[model samples]
Target: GLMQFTLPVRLCKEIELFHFDIGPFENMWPGIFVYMVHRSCGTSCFELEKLCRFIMSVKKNYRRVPYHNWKHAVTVAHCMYAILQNNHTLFTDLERKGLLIACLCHDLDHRGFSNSYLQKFDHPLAALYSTSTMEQHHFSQTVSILQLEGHNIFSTLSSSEYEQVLEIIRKAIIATDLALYFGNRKQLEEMYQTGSLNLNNQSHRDRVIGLMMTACDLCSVTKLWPVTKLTANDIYAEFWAEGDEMKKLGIQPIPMMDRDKKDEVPQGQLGFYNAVAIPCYTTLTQILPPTEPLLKACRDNLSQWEKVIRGEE
Candidate 1:
């Protein structure tokens, strides 16, 4: 039986309107996860309520950072939801569930600092993971949330199934680090170049999941110009804050993080689209034709960034 819970009217509307197109849902971010799990997992009413409570708890755990807050997590999860809905046959049921939940929790407890920044300052999380620092912390925090009473939504799954789900979730969340995405994309691109990419293979499918996590993480690049600009501004706010911190520590900020180089934002975005976002989406479309729209959106945004760089917009 389908679950029933009294969601806020605005949340209900947001869920009903969530589709391929991007708009505003920052205020109703939690609704995205609730609707996503409810539709994909088919949990009971009690399970749904527990899921909602968990979502609320997750939201509370996120720091009020400029970009890596609950809103960004919701947006990433929404992108995964859209991708899964569009290409339902592309991934296994476990893959879909893992990808969606991973997106929602991937940035949990973010401190508005990059992994490099953390390592440079000898942040505690950096010492703990020694690699993929932020991602490891995010995954650990996700597990902590699930361990909370009444939040173990996967408790009903059989032992093996639960283990499989947890493994997938771990891989999916860890893949969100851009450092890993570069190597992952190179490997997947090589498979495509040699015409050896096979979806049926578990290894190949895992690589695809990693690529999809990155695509959703940068979903802003595939959004409308206004939305893209707004998100980019938020991201730079976070970057600049980190730059300020680095200066206080007697360190020079990277060009991209330096607030004084705000003029470079458009140029940096242009380079990113050409170098990373475009290639990532292009590779996905090559493997899953249904994802062509994502590539199209990216190309459109690239053009907008070009115009901005030229002061043409």
Candidate 2:
């Protein structure tokens, strides 16, 4: 049996205070996340050990890319944990477990390139999924990890529960694709407008969970100014790397991805905040008001980006 680890006394207090600042606790994320899952899902000591091993395996599988690495996955998982803590009863027990695992594995095995790059370059992943290419790969990678010997933490689940958890994990990971966020946003807005956004309704609940996944996936945008800026630059580093590769292959990368147009990043980010991040946080807040801080943080970061765009930062 693996040795059991407990959350640090300080982390336990911080979690109780809803203080989820990830900066100071970067090295402790795996332990923190394991504690969260154990507390929420009531895993036994043996199961907790299995989960800890599973998390380490998943973390190592993530590439050492500029973004979409283990650090990003841990941040997203932390965000999910924060959300679950604040709204403890919002999701059913199974849904909560599924969402937490999905956040942790959403970008598993990312190659530091966008789906567009994969499709345009005829990457094998694109050929296999035909749509939501990177997301499908991420989910498949997650399943592969679970199938490995001594890594099936969910093996204790009943057959039916295991299927349900996998189903939810698949949906949640696939929903991380920004291409699908638009339709999800529209559908959620419609439900809200019609006063039909019922959490008791499975369809509506699933949609909310989907949107939640997107919110967690883009959690960096809602971080404090410095963290947000640093994460944005790191992400663009990965994007520019992809562009460099495309250029080597004689393909013209989009302006946002092109390293030569690095100055365009702030402006492009401004548009992204207006068109995507702000709207995403706004919609999420409508359903989970505790997430209002995410909206405010994004607005604050957007203003900072505006300053930078105008040469004020």
Candidate 3:
């Protein structure tokens, strides 16, 4: 007996597209993506691909698209890569490797929506692992895969050296959890204000890797034009869907995406750039010009979203 369900049509389409995108990536993408993530974590290429392969494997098992899709992974990798290219003088070899590793495995198995949604639904993963615990869980999962005896990516390295690499990678990846972003931003702002780019006396590798990983996560509002708009649309849809789901569950809906609601803007594709994405990214770019053009594009998106929000055809 074949157990079959008519999965969401759109989900199937998205899956098709996901598969197509991943195919061209297998040969060249993992290595390049690994390079970016490793750079963010201040590690090297060794075992980087192994980490990626494991992420893909986990995705297959999860069935749900964690907010950390391959596309998102590539996006983070690109952002980190851009920073490395632009801020070359500031990084050491280890920092470069660490940064890339951080980006690569940051969301190794993200479940869609934030942790709040996970908790609300009593999702097994969420119930078993709270926000803080989930982050630790994700880091442990990545490290566990990396430490598999025969498949251990760091097999050539001594135990102490492996521990060092593991520690940096864990810190960088854990930092990706959005909960840390607020505090992370404060530290970054202070660093920028004082022009003090030090990693707090930690190895040069740790400092730059930390900065780059944080920067990449925060760089969304600064993405290029069409890609930015497309991503915003996807995110808005997800938000709305989750809001609707909350409504069905008799839960107080997460505001903003609900229609017939005044407090939050109707969660839609329109005006998203203006309301949240644009303002946030614009603020970031003011302090970092590398993001200026990206912010400008987002501003343009805001205008587009505004028009649609007003019921303009």
Best by lDDT: 2
Global fold similarity of model 3 (TM-score): 0.68
lDDT of 2 by residue, 52-108 (tens): 788998988899898889888878887787788779777787877788889999999
TM of each candidate vs. truth = 0.92, 0.93, 0.68
The C-alpha stretches of model 1 lying farther than 4 A from their native spots are 1-27, 43-46
lDDT of each: 0.82, 0.84, 0.56
- Give lDDT tens digits, candidate 1, residues 9-118: 65455443322333365555665566666665544522666777778888888999988988888888887877787786677767766677788899999999999899
Instruction: Note the clash tally of each candidate.
Output: 0, 0, 26
Overall local distance difference test of candidate 2: 0.84
> Lowest lDDT 10-mer window, candidate 3?
14-23
Top candidate when judged by TM-score against the true structure: 2
